[PDB]
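Crash report, auto-generated. Payload:
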Amino acid sequence: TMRAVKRMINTHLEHKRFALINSGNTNATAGTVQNLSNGIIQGDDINQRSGDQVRIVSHKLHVRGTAITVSQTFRFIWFRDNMNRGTTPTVLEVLNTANFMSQYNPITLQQKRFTILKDVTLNCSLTGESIKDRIINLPGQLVNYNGATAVAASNGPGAIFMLQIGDSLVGLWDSSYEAVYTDA
Amino acid sequence: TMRAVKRMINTHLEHKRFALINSGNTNATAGTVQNLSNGIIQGDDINQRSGDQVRIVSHKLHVRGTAITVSQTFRFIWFRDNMNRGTTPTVLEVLNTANFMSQYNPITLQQKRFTILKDVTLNCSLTGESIKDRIINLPGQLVNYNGATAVAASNGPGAIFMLQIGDSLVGLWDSSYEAVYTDA
Amino acid sequence: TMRAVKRMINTHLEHKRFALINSGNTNATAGTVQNLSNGIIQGDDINQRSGDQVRIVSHKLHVRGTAITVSQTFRFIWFRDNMNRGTTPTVLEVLNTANFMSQYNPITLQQKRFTILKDVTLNCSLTGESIKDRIINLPGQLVNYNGATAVAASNGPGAIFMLQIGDSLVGLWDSSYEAVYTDA
Amino acid sequence: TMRAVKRMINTHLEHKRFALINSGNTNATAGTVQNLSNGIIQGDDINQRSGDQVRIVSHKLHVRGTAITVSQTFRFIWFRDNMNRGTTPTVLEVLNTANFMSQYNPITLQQKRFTILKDVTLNCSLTGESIKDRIINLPGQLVNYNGATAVAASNGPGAIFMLQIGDSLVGLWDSSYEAVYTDA
Amino acid sequence: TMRAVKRMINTHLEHKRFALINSGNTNATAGTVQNLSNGIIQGDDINQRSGDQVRIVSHKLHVRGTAITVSQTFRFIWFRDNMNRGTTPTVLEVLNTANFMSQYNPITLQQKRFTILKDVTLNCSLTGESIKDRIINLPGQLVNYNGATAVAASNGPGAIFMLQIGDSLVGLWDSSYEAVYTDA
Amino acid sequence: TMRAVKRMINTHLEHKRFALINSGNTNATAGTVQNLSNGIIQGDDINQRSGDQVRIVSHKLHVRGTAITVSQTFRFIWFRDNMNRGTTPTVLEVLNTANFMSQYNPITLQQKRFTILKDVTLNCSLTGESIKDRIINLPGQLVNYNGATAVAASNGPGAIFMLQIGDSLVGLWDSSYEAVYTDA
Amino acid sequence: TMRAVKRMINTHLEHKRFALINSGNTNATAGTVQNLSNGIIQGDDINQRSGDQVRIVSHKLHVRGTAITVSQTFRFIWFRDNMNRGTTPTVLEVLNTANFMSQYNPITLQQKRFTILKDVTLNCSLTGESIKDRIINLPGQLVNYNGATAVAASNGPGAIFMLQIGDSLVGLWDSSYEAVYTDA
Amino acid sequence: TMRAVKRMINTHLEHKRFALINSGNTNATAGTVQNLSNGIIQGDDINQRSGDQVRIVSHKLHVRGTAITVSQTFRFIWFRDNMNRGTTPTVLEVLNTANFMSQYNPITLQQKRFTILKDVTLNCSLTGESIKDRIINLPGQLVNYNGATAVAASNGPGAIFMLQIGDSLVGLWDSSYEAVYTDA
Amino acid sequence: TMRAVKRMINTHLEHKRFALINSGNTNATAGTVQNLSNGIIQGDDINQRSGDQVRIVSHKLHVRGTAITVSQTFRFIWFRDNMNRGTTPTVLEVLNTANFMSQYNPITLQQKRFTILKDVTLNCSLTGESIKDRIINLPGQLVNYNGATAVAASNGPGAIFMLQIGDSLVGLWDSSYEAVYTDA
Amino acid sequence: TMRAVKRMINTHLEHKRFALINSGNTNATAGTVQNLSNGIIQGDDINQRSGDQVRIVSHKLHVRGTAITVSQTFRFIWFRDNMNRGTTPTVLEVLNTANFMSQYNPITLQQKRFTILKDVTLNCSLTGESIKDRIINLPGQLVNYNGATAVAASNGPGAIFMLQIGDSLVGLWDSSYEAVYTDA
Amino acid sequence: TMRAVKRMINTHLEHKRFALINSGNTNATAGTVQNLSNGIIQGDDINQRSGDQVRIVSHKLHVRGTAITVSQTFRFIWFRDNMNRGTTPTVLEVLNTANFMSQYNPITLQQKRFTILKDVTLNCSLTGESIKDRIINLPGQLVNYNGATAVAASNGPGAIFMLQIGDSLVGLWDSSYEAVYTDA
Ligand SMILES: [Ca+2]
Ligand SMILES: [Ca+2]
Ligand SMILES: [Ca+2]
Ligand SMILES: [Ca+2]
Ligand SMILES: [Ca+2]
Ligand SMILES: [Ca+2]
Ligand SMILES: [Ca+2]
Ligand SMILES: [Ca+2]
Ligand SMILES: [Ca+2]
Ligand SMILES: [Ca+2]
Ligand SMILES: [Ca+2]
Ligand SMILES: [Ca+2]
Ligand SMILES: [Ca+2]
Ligand SMILES: [Ca+2]
Ligand SMILES: [Ca+2]
Ligand SMILES: [Ca+2]
Ligand SMILES: [Ca+2]
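Recovered output after restart:
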């Protein structure tokens, strides 16, 4: 009945909820890393937290790419930083080289610095489907924080991020994110 | 046999049926909300109701988008308003911000004001597939009404709606809907 | 075992076979209804029948649409008329309104006048895939006739039809149909 | 409990019946092939068929030879053509060489193009028994047809034939044949 | 343990292999029939045969179409001729009418002259995906031959073919085929 | 078990087939010995062999005699030479004396040099039945060869022969023979 | 139990990791063969090896094609060379003919010189989706080497390769590859 | 058997060994952090490693303090950095304040950035026992590295360190360390 | 009931047989490699093969050395090349150095390129036993070929060879070889 | 109980006995075949036989070689001729080529014309052991004869022989033989 | 189930291999000791090691002697030095006296300083067999080393050696050695 104890435990805990949107970004050939969980700050509201831990019950990521000028590729890597000490990770920490085709960095994946949640490649064609999107929903895990406010120094172990990278600087991408979490 | 009892009960109940069509609508960047169950009004006909309750056995939504002038995105959110007190809900009650990429409103979803039945995004490309459609069929639930006629004030707990929102004002969408319901 | 005697029974019965083709038709905004089983007439040949009943073992419908002039939609509704009294059914008997987005007629579906076998929508784009097709194969049922020849008055309960309806008058569609049937 | 079911199925099926006679033919040193099942044509009578299949329950062949001028040999080969595509098969399809002593064609027998039902050799002597006959009765099989009328093009898989070949051109042979068949 | 006999048996039998390619053919509105297994001729090599039988363990067909001048359809029907007596079958033997939309010939399918292995339609659009392909792998059956060399008269019962038919004469199609077979 | 396995082994083996005719020979008072299996030579065709062994599944001998000038006797001895070293055996190897009434050679039979398959005597009368024939079908055994071509030196252990001997030189006899064999 | 033992063994072995990228290659009508595992050289780093064996736990191949000038096809064949003696295999070793439609080489596949891991065809259309990609992850096997450095002479049994071949010289393809391997 | 497995595995693995000494250091009131596992570098010797992981079977730390000028306290904190990304951690990451009496940093301990292996305080008195020492032996865990050589950037998750802090700058402390590890 | 199957399958398969003799060879200080199974070529005779596989049931090697001028050593290594791609292997592929005392090549033996069947050393003395010989019989395995004729290019995986090497150029060695094989 | 009955049967049967010696023969490079059982002739003595059969219970062969002029090899092949028709077999019937190194004749061994009882090679050296001998005892089999006296024509199925062949004409060999046989 | 784990463990470990040859040495009356395992040095190649331990799975020693001038004796003692501290053992450490007939040193054998693997004496006669050889294969044990390179100081506990001693200074001996070892 351990599955029953877990359930009733959860019925006593508020499932707080945080939403984020990030629209109108340029595709990046060298890549960028975007914060997802950083925006849950200390405070008393439904989308805030008490202390330096929350536990994500589920979270959802929506990504979108639109080709501009040339047909092009957008890659989105949704990941957990298991070992974050107050930074936004770099592209080269996640990828072997800063290229949209690159495989993961062998060292950081060997030691499990990161866990990859989803790796999505969208090809947007100006002679075909020039707009593409993907939404992904996943159960979550503990998130630890190193500080109270929405700055990079507050990220901690379990922080959630998304790396974007592609083969042009000209196309535009949008994202949004929701986390449902307890905070007991 | 409680399953055979349900079966036998439903065979004594008329399965009334209501149909609706809504076409030639422009895409909305701030969103709109369409009524679906509101059109079942008090009366004696096959697509009407006695009293202020019906029970939807099954219902079906057909949505369609056509890109005009620019390639563009159409989002359709089919939802149940569990707590309706005589209104058509606003876009911002359902979505955190009035943007086609937005996640759900954290507060109204935490409290289960709404239940999302299906959330559909169609990307219509003028260099590709410019017309897209989707039909979804689902078992239904109780619908309560707050009045006799087809006005917002008659919507009640269980009312069914569709939110439309997109990234352009220029393309056109169409929808249709059927509900099969008992009224005993 | 009955599943066995059923097997042995069928091995003593000739599986007669009827094929039909219907090419180069215009898309119809008000819709049309095409005959499928009507062409099995009284006679002694492999694609004919003795008496006024056959039993369809399996039947197969192939539909195809080609956009002309504008990107457009073709809908094909394969159906059985459970109650036919010597007619070709009208579009409005099947659909609530004569529009390619319409839901079914609530009255005729409530009373089970028709059974929908498959409902197929093909979106043909002159900036994308302008030619689309679908083949569907299904087990069949009894077909009764009201006369000997290939005229509407000969359709009877169980007659098989296809409704075609779309959003333009200028695209072209094709269909073909096969029925494999016993006639004992 | 099938055996008794086979019996019961058969009691519901008309056992149609077809008879043929073919008298006064000359012995052939190069052989000839005679039709037996071909004469069952599409029609409504007791010795006709609905559609392009019948199932022979039993069939019977009677052959007879009479020596004239010299003592001589008549051979009769009763056979099924499992693969007929609308022909009367040739002597060389069945026999390795066109001689009354020949063994079967190795290729057509290997691939089971033909099944030999009975192979009968009668030696008719003008100093002994100058007239000889043989009657053979066997259970039958499915017969498929490729058309409606009594022409070679209507023979199909399962067609029944008799090859006659001997060592003189002058003796006379007679045959007759009956098929009892269902036609459900 | 009798299932392991089959396996044990097959480890003692050489699995010979034959490959074929057939590139750059025009789409045909009246259709053509292409040989697939005919090219396995008598001889001592890995892609030849001893005698007039082989047993296909598996075989693979790859088809491809490219639109030229107009958007168009290519249909490919992979089939076994269960009753071949030394021909390449005609289009009308397989199809009711010589049209890319046609259903199968009712007579030849009734009598099981042919067994359809796969029926594939590719729609190639010059405003979309102008090149399409399909690869299909299936277990095989006995193949009998009527002669030694790669001519039509050598086809026999079990011979494997592909019918090609489409709605234009101008597009080009390619095919390739492999059979893995035992020859004991 | 062993019964099914044997059956299954044979389903994977080509049953090759060889046919032979030998017409119009004179009755021989000193006897002759005719080759039957010798004519299966090395090669790739249906009536040839790989290597120096085949296994006869079944074989059939047809013999015929016709009296000329005087009533007379024809004897046909169908036999296997279990020990053949590249010869056509002599009459005296098989028969004690070279006379149509003779019993077998005591020595060669004691040591099982030969196995008698069938011994047939036909008395043909010019005042009665002047023409007689007999067909015999038997399961077969291994046949080894000592060479590749249809010459006496290629006969080997298991070779099949027929001795003919009679009481006149003037009558004529005919024979034919078939062997069905595997060659794995 | 041997299952949990596989578990405990592997937790004591370092899972070394190697990554590779190969961008901006022209499509090849005669094909090329690319090295994948060759780049793991003798050394002490995370992406190197001790001795001449490693065991690939998992490996991942990402392929991508972009049509240039004409719509065109790119095929990628990921394979293991079970028998490599210090070479990069040739296109004719893997394919019956050097054509993007070709089936596999009958001889090298019969003898299991190669094991095909995945065979991918991407059709890239300049009127449609001009950019396409595919990522494939598979468990791996032992890899033996014939030398220490990243040259063809160091490939050995188990070496991993990708063959690229298409129908134009003008389009561009990219690939990347990761192997996770033990080196105990 | 299970516990035997672990023990059997280990007899097949070389237990490499690394020793370190660090003598004659001043007591630090603000503290210092010393590297312990960092000195195991890539190479082939008994005290080196292949790749970027080793597994410490056991490790031993010896610490010593000598009071000089004033009686004083030396604290030594042996710890594992579970999340190291290529640094030597600071005193303030481990201790709430940089004082020898401080409790641990609440945040880094909450999130398990560090695991404390042992925390030892030696009070050295110039009127009593002026020299004190402690040796501690513990089983070990996996160590991951971020580089090949003995620099801070090579430290990785599982790196082992010792923090020293006290209440004078004048006393002297010594330490030494051994790790016994597998490297398979 | 499974061991009986093996035995039963083999009784239906011809045990073909190939013999070879290779007399009067000089002893070689740098070694030579002799072909043994290469001489079985495609064809229809008892010592030939159909296709590119045979299965050796048993094979026998006889080797002999005679000292001339000086007492000397002859070594013979009977081996299977598991990975042959159409060559005669070199001495250095099999042996670490080209010397009659050499141990095997570490790399090719590690990866199982070769399987050593028998390694025989004969010391022939002009003051003692100047002639020595050895005969070895072993069960065999599958042999694959890469072509039809007796050239090195036709050797394939499973090819059988003998390496000869010694300490003089002047003595003479002889060999002979037989393989008994199935070829189904 | 096959063991007891068999023993008792033999106690009632005279075990007759025949001895032979054959001294002072030259080594033969083309080989010779010597008779062993032939010398048991019809008669009433202990070393003779009644009729044309005996059963060898046991037999013993002693062979010896003496080098003269040159060190040389003597081979002795003791064999049974299972199919003898009154000859002394030739060397080429037994050996592939007439050389002391030859393997057996593939054809005559395949068909089991001969059974090899023992194959012995003696290397006689004028600088070592110049005289060698070997004695071999085996259980025997049935021997059939084709005549009464000690001439080649009396040899029959089961006759026992010895083939001698070597690499010189000048050395001398001796043999002796005994057969113990029943003659009931 | 510990023979399964042992087996499974070893399938994950590279079996490295080292080969050695040592030709053309003089017989020694006072003896010599040759190194065998010392040549496995630290490095990354197939015949090298990581760290200071390997585990020999099997090893093989080949020894050979040739008499020169006088008939003479060669003795070879293959042994493991269980206690080596970085030397090459002396002859008197192994043998009681430095004479080829000596028994072992009582003190070093009592304390098990050495384990004798094989002790071989070859008597080479210039009036008989002047060349003799022996190959010995044995399972191995752990080998520890005391340094990185192929010098005496690197030998450690488990080092493998061969002592050679004889009764002449003028004959020549050869040896070779192979170790197969894991290095995990
Ligand atoms: Ca909290
Ligand atoms: Ca109500
Ligand atoms: Ca009629
Ligand atoms: Ca009817
Ligand atoms: Ca019928
Ligand atoms: Ca065959
Ligand atoms: Ca397009
Ligand atoms: Ca051939
Ligand atoms: Ca054969
Ligand atoms: Ca390794
Ligand atoms: Ca190294
Ligand atoms: Ca490591
Ligand atoms: Ca073969
Ligand atoms: Ca007597
Ligand atoms: Ca007797
Ligand atoms: Ca080691
Ligand atoms: Ca001597």
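Post-recovery validation: The first strand of chain B starts at residue 16 and ends at 26.
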